[PDB]
Design a binder for this molecule. Sequence first.
Ligand SMILES: O=c1[nH]cnc2c1ncn2CCN(CCO/C=C/P(=O)(O)O)CCP(=O)(O)O
Ligand SMILES: O=c1[nH]cnc2c1ncn2CCN(CCO/C=C/P(=O)(O)O)CCP(=O)(O)O
Ligand SMILES: O=c1[nH]cnc2c1ncn2CCN(CCO/C=C/P(=O)(O)O)CCP(=O)(O)O
Ligand SMILES: O=c1[nH]cnc2c1ncn2CCN(CCO/C=C/P(=O)(O)O)CCP(=O)(O)O
Ligand SMILES: [Mg+2]
Ligand SMILES: [Mg+2]
Ligand SMILES: [Mg+2]
Ligand SMILES: [Mg+2]
Lengths: 172, 170, 172, 170
Amino acid sequence: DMKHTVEVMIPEAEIKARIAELGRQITERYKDSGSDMVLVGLLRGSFMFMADLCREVQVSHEVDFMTASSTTRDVKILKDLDEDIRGKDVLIVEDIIDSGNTLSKVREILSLREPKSLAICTLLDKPSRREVNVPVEFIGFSIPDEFVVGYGIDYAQRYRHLPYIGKVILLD
Amino acid sequence: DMKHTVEVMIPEAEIKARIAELGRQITERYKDSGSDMVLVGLLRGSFMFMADLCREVQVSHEVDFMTASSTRDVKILKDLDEDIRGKDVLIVEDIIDSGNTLSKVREILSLREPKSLAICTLLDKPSRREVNVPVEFIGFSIPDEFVVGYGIDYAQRYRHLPYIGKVILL
Amino acid sequence: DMKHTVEVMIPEAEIKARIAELGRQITERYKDSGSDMVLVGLLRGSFMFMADLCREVQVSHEVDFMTASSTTRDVKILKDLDEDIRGKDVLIVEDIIDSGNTLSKVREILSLREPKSLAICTLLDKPSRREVNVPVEFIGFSIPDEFVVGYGIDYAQRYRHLPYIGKVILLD
Amino acid sequence: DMKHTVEVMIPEAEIKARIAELGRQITERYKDSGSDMVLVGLLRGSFMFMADLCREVQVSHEVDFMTASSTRDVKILKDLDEDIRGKDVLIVEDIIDSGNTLSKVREILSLREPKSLAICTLLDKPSRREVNVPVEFIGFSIPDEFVVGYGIDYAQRYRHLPYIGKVILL
Ligand SMILES: O=c1[nH]cnc2c1ncn2CCN(CCO/C=C/P(=O)(O)O)CCP(=O)(O)O
Ligand SMILES: O=c1[nH]cnc2c1ncn2CCN(CCO/C=C/P(=O)(O)O)CCP(=O)(O)O
Ligand SMILES: O=c1[nH]cnc2c1ncn2CCN(CCO/C=C/P(=O)(O)O)CCP(=O)(O)O
Ligand SMILES: O=c1[nH]cnc2c1ncn2CCN(CCO/C=C/P(=O)(O)O)CCP(=O)(O)O
Ligand SMILES: [Mg+2]
Ligand SMILES: [Mg+2]
Ligand SMILES: [Mg+2]
Ligand SMILES: [Mg+2]
C-alpha cells in the first residue's frame, strides 16, 4: 500500500514473440516422445503464461494446475493435481523464479510420483535473487533485480490483467 | 474414448474478435463502479478464456480461481484465495450448459455478500438447461454439439487448442 | 507467546459424563428417522469431541470433516466434505462457539446442498461473546468468558491433547 | 455393499489398554527430545485413534491432520496446517496394509526435513505388504480379516463403533 507507478519492461509484442519461440523449443524436445505429456501450472500467477504457451506447444498434451506456497516455512500443497503424472513427460510452468525455494520443493514433490521426465519452464528469471541451485530447462526472460508486475504477476493482488510486463516504481 | 477426429468450429480469429467485444461490454458495465472488482474463473476449463478476457477488460480488477466438484453435491475442491465481500464479482466459465454447477457456485459466492454478482461464459448451450441461472455475458450460443478446445477437454485432450473444435466420431 | 498457566475448568470425568448425556439426547432425536445420518466435524479443534460423541451416538451414521476459516474476512472452505449430505440428517460438531460468525456461515453453506435436516452440536458455548443469532440444538457446557484450552482446543497450537478443559491464566 | 453382520473382534476395553501402553512407549521415546513434537493423523480413518492416543502421550505436542488420495498417484487433498521442519513427527494411521499410501506420505513429509519421522498404526496386516515401510509403533497385528470400527469404515458405515468388529458376509 505504497504510492507508486508502473513502467513497461517487456512489451506485449516482445512476450508473444518470445513465447512463440519457447513453443518451438518445447515442441522440438517432446515431439518424438512416445509417452503422454502434461503441462503443470503453478497457481495463481501462471494462468496467463500457461494459456499462451500451451497454444504454442504443438504436441498433444494435458493441462493441469497445482497451488503451493511457503520466516522460513514449509512448502505445502493447497491444491494438488487433478490427474496422475506417473510415466508422463511433465513440464512445470511458472511465472517467475526469484529465490528458487518454492519451485525446488515442488519439483521434489512431483518427482516422487515418478514421471518419465521432469522439466521447468518459467517466463521470467531473476538470477540475482537465486538462493537454491534449481535446473530450469526453458526461460523466457532473464530480468534485472526489479519488482515486476503484469501477465498474471501481481503487486498486492493488483495488475495481473496487464498484457505486458511492467516494473513497480516507488515515489516520494 | 472412441475413434474420432477434430475439425475447426470457431477459429481463433473469431474467438479473439468476440472476446474483444466482451471486454468492451464488461468495461462499460463496471467502469463507474468505484468498488473493487474481481474475475473468478472455474478451473480447469476456464483458464485460457480468463487469460484472454481479463486482458480485454480495461478496469482495475483482481483475478481469482476456484475448483468445484464435477445428481451429486457441488463441493469445493479449492476455494478462492481472496475475499469478495463488497466487491463486484464476475464469474468466468468456459461453457454454461445444464446450469447445475454454475447455479450452486453462484449461491455459495452470494453468501459472502459481494456488491454485485454476474456470470460470463464463452459458450452457451440453451437446450441442455435444467436450472435457470442468469448469465449476463455470453460469447457464443451453440447447438448441442460435442465441442473441444480453448480449455475444454475430451478425456483430458485438446485443452490447448487455440480454437473451438468439433469432435467427429467414427 | 506470553507467560501463563493452565487451570482446570471442566474435569475429564465431567466431560465424559456430559458427552454420554449428549449421546442419549442425539440418539433419541434421530433414532426414528428413515434417512441416513452424518456427523460433520469442523477441523481442527473438534476431532476429539467427535471421537467421543459419535461413540455415544447409538444411531447408524457416517463421520465426515470439513475445514473452514475466516479485519472481517469471508468464511472459505479449505477442505470440503468427502461425502454428499443431500437428503440426510446432518449434525455439525464443533468444539466451541464464540461469536457464532464461522458456524453461521458454515450452516448456510451446508444448507445449500439441501439435507433432510440440519443441526448443530457444540461442546462449549460462550454466550457472552455471541455476535450472531445462531440456533444450537445441543450444547455440552455454557462457559464463562474465559480463554479455554484442552480437548482439541488450542492456545498457540498448544494443549490440544489435554483430556480436560483448562483455562489459560496469564502471569505478571 | 452386501448382506452382512458385524461381531466384536477387539473390545474397547482391550483397545483402551493397548493404547495406554502405546502412550507409555511414545512418551518414553520422545520425552528427552527437547524439540517440538507433532502427531499427524491421516483422515478420515485415524481421527478416533488420534483422539485416544494423544491423550495417552505425556509429552507436549501439536496435533495436525492431512488427507491423502485413496496403481494411482498419492495426491494431497488437504495438507498440514502447521510446519514440521526441525520437529519430531509421528504419523498416526488406523491400519497399515499394503504399505503404499503410508510410504508415499512418509516420503512427502520427509522433504520438509523434520528432526525425526516415525509411524504409529493401530492395526497392521503384515501379509498384504507391497512396500516395506518401517513402522515403529503397532497396536495390533491381525490376519487378513475384513475389519471395521474405530474410524475404519465399510461403505461409509461403522466408523463410530467403539470396538474393532469383523464383517461377516452372508
Ligand atoms: O518481482 C516479483 N513480483 C511479484 N512476485 C514476486 C516477485 N519476485 C518474487 N516474487 C514472488 C514469487 N514467488 C511466488 C509468486 O508466485 C505466486 C504468485 P501469487 O499466488 O499471486 O502470490 C515465488 C518465487 P520462488 O520460486 O523463488 O520461491
Ligand atoms: O459439448 C461439451 N463438450 C465438453 N464438455 C461439455 C460439453 N457440454 C457440457 N460440457 C461440460 C459441462 N460442464 C463443464 C464444467 O467445466 C468444468 C471444467 P473441468 O474441470 O475440465 O471439468 C459443466 C456442465 P454445467 O455447468 O451445466 O453443470
Ligand atoms: O477460548 C478460546 N480458545 C481457543 N479458541 C477460541 C476461543 N474462543 C474462540 N476461539 C476461536 C474459535 N473459533 C475458531 C476455533 O476453531 C478452530 C480451532 P483451530 O483450527 O485449532 O484454530 C471459532 C469461534 P466462532 O464460531 O464464534 O467464529
Ligand atoms: O480389512 C480392511 N477393512 C477396511 N479397510 C481396509 C482393510 N484393509 C485395508 N483397508 C484399507 C487400507 N487403506 C486405508 C487407508 O485409510 C484411509 C482412511 P479413509 O479416508 O476412510 O479411506 C490403506 C491401505 P495402505 O496404507 O496399505 O495403502
Ligand atoms: Mg510462480
Ligand atoms: Mg466449465
Ligand atoms: Mg471450532
Ligand atoms: Mg488409514
